[PDB]
Structure formats: C-alpha cells, structure tokens
Amino acid sequence: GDDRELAILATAENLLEDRPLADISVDDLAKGAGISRPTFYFYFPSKEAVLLTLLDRVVNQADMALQTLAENPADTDRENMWRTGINVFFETFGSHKAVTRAGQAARATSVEVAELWSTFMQKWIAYTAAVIDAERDRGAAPRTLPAHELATALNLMNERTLFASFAGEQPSVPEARVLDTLVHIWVTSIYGE
Template sequence: MTTAGQTRALRGRRAIRPSGDDREQAILATAERLLEERGFGAISVDDLAKGAGLSRPTFYFYFKSKEAVVLSLLEPVIARADSEFDGAIQRLPADPRRVWRNGIKAFFTAFASNRALARAATEALASSSELRSVWSDYMQKWIDQTTAMIIAERARGAAPETIAAADLATSLNQMNERTMMAALSAATPAVDQDRVVDTLTHIWVASIYGESG
C-alpha cells in the first residue's frame, strides 16, 4: 500500500524532472557555450543534444535543426536591436542625428553583447536557406522603417530629394550589416569596434541630409 507520504514523495520526484522549458533552455545554453568554443559549422545536432543531456530524438522535439537553435538565440538580440526604432519617426524632428545614432548603436550593442552568436549567424547565413529567409525578412523590415523615416524627413524639408528613399535605405542597412559583422568577427579589413557607431552614423547622416553631387 502506498502511504500519503510516499505519494507526496513520488509527486515531489516527478516535480523535479526537467520540464519542456528546461530542456529547451538546456539546448540553448549548450549552443551558447559551444559557439564560444568553436564555429557554427563544427557543431552538430549530436553535440547540442549531448551537451543538454538529451537524446537526438528528444532534441528534434524542440528544434528541427541547429539553425533553428541559432534563430531562437537571435530573437531576443534582434528584439533589443529593434526596440530603439519604436517611435523613432516621431522623435526625428527634435534631434535627427541622435535618433539615427541611437538606432545604429542599439543594433551594434545588441550583437556585440554576444559576439559568438553574431559570428555564428554570419557563418550560418552562407549555408542555411532557412536562416537567410528569416534574416531577409528582418532586413526588409528595417529597410522599410528607414525608408519611411527618410521620406518623413524629406516631407518636412529637413532632407533633400536625392536618390530614391528605398534605394538609399537598402544601401545603408546592408552597409550596416556588413560593417558591423566584419568588426564583430575581427575580419580584415574592418572598422575598429570603438569607431563603428560613429563611422556609420556619419555616413547615414551625410547620405540622408547631404545635397546631391
């Protein structure tokens, strides 16, 4: 016969078994640790599962691929980078340079806080169509936001009508991506990390507010 105390004990043992959230977090923590030690291409699903104390089939219950793990790690980083653009178009008239700089700084700081992840994302973009598709969606969102802000500045007479706003926004955002990732991955050549934000801000402000040549 099972006593009440034994029942409580059994419940207690069940309660401390890893939950689904715990297992998912274990996989993510393993990925972060391994990315500090080696490149994305050198990490396998087996490495992630073993490091999290799980079987390979259990891993696939939570993530469909190692690229999906990187995407999950990227989500909060991108959210931090994105936060500075909330309401930015309304703040532009007060101090345009500060608004552009804050947006660029937020993006760079978010990715600089996890350089290993930034390097992994750059590496994975070259080989993963899944990651490229998601990243492309984010890039398009940032380009659209920038386009709207440039159009607003032109409409209030603060910026001149030069090249198409969408073309300018696309070029500036793609420049940001390449310049930041080169700096964070210690590529050669690259802008020094301490000068990335000011360098990019200068180019953005000069491109948006400068007269056509």
C-alpha cells in the first residue's frame, strides 16, 4: 500500500530527471511502479498529484531541517550561522533538482503547487525576519529596512538564484559558488549600516 505509493513516487522522480511532466504519462508511472493504470488511480488522482506530493515531501524536508537548526544553534560566528541556514535549502533542493525544476514549472498551472510554495515561503520569510529582529534587539544589526521587507527580497533572491544554479540556466551563478554568493549578500545587507 505505502509500498506501491513509494514506488510510484520514486518512478516519477526518476523519470523527471530525463523529461518534463508533460512528456510523462500515467501509463509510464504505472509501468515503472509495476502496477496497472487503474491501480495507479487508486493511489493518485493524476500525474500532477504525484508531482504535488513529491514537492510537498521536499518542502517539508527543508522546513524540518531548518526547524532542527533553529532548536540547535551551531556554535560559530554570525556569518557561519546564516550560511548553515541557507545551506538547508542548497542541500535539500539541490538533492532533488528534478522535483525542484518540475515544481517550479507547475506553479504556473497548478493552484495547489502555487499555494504550497506560497505557504512555506511565508513561513521562511517570517522566520528570517524574526531572526533579523532578534539581531537588531540585541544590538548586533542596525535598524535599516523593515526586517520583513528585507527578509522577503533575500528569500526571493535565494529562490531564483538557487534554482537557476541547479538548472544550469544562462545566466546563473555556478553551483559551487552560489552558497558563498548568497551568504555574502545576506550578511552585508543584514549587518551593513
């Protein structure tokens, strides 16, 4: 039960490395998972629902990793603390590039994919703004822009720049340089007067 479902998910993630969702059929997912077409429809209403679940799992993996960090501060300087946090997203989405690229494309068409992304982006921006606020309250960061507006632009920068790097878009920061590039802009814009 959970086995056939996992099989369908694993097939979809494998097939998405090679072609987009449009070029993958329900019959394709069923065949890869070793089931018939009506059996597929018993676990998922559509191939698009399969992508939704894959993206949901990726998003929650990142969110849980970030929650772990939040409850277990690394013992290091401020620059390293922001790096560890951005690194959650570099590693989690960068470990699932095909789901990330397909999930990105699906935002234009799927209201469920758009709302899932939007919900978690609001959560990650709120967390970012809360940490900035904490840093200002402690006297470590200057009161410049509204924390929440700053947090919004920096998280949108990371969304676009990470996902261009993973897709090898032209232009993009090389994937081996993107973490350092992002950490620099976050630290200078959060702490710079």
